[PDB]
Amino acid sequence: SWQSYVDDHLMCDVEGNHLTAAAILGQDGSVWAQSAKFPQLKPQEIDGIKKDFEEPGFLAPTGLFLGGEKYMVIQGEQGAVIRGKKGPGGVTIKKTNQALVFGFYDEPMTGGQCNLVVERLGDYLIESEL
Numbered sequence: 001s002w003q004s005y006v007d008d009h010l011m012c013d014v015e016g017n018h019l020t021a022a023a024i025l026g027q028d029g030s031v032w033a034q035s036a037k038f039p040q041l042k043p044q045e046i047d048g049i050k051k052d053f054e055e056p057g058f059l060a061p062t063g064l065f066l067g068g069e070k071y072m073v074i075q076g077e078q079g080a081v082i083r084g085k086k087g088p089g090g091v092t093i094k095k096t097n098q099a100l101v102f103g104f105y106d107e108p109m110t111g112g113q114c115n116l117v118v119e120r121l122g123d124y125l126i127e128s129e130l
Contacts, residue, residue, distance in 0.1 A: 002033035009121045010103060011035055017109035019117065020089070023102045024125075032099070039067030039104075046100075053079050053095050066091060066102075074111075081119060083111065090114065094122030098130050 002024055010022035023034035029046045031038075045065050052059040056078045064071040064084040071084030071091060082093040089106040092114045103118035105111065 005121060005125075006033040006035055009124075010101070010117055012117065014109070014113040014117055017105075017113060019103050019109070019114065020106045021102075021104040022118075025100050025102065026098060027095075027100055038102070039069075041066055042068070049082060049093060049100065052082055064091070081115075081122075083115065085111070092118040094118050096122050096125040096130055099125060101125070 005024060006022050011018050019035070021035045021038040023038045024032045025034075025041075025046070026032060027050065029041075029043065042065075045067075048059055048065065052064075056076070059082070060073045064073050064082065066084075069086065071086045074083045074085050074090070076083045080095055084091050089104070090111050091105070092103045092111070094101040094103075101118050101122045103114045105114035
């Protein structure tokens with residue numbers, strides 16, 4: 001289900017650590033599944049994300065805001081992945097055909113481990129035509 005993807009794919013422990021929160025939202029902004037601590041995102045934030053996927057670099061000067069919190073944009077994949085850092089944590093956002101997979105991490109988990117779980121699920125949904 002969309003909820004087993006969140007709980008079993010995204011929240012699966014990678015080297016003992018797991019995401020602080022995860023979710024799959026439809027690109028219209030609606031939540032299909034989310035973990036318990038996932039943030040309430042604003043409309044304008046979901047819009048900035050979609051705009052950065054069309055015009056990469058759109059978010060860098062201003063920051064990646066999620067839940068009213070600022071993230072500093074870090075290197076991603078054009079039109080495919082947006083990554084950010086906020087102190088010892090960060091977030092990875094993977095764009096699929098119909099969705100947006102989000103992954104929030106906090107130390108001791110690393111960015112590489114968050115990228116791994118988030119992007120692999122994203123490539124799996126993309127394969128299933130989602």
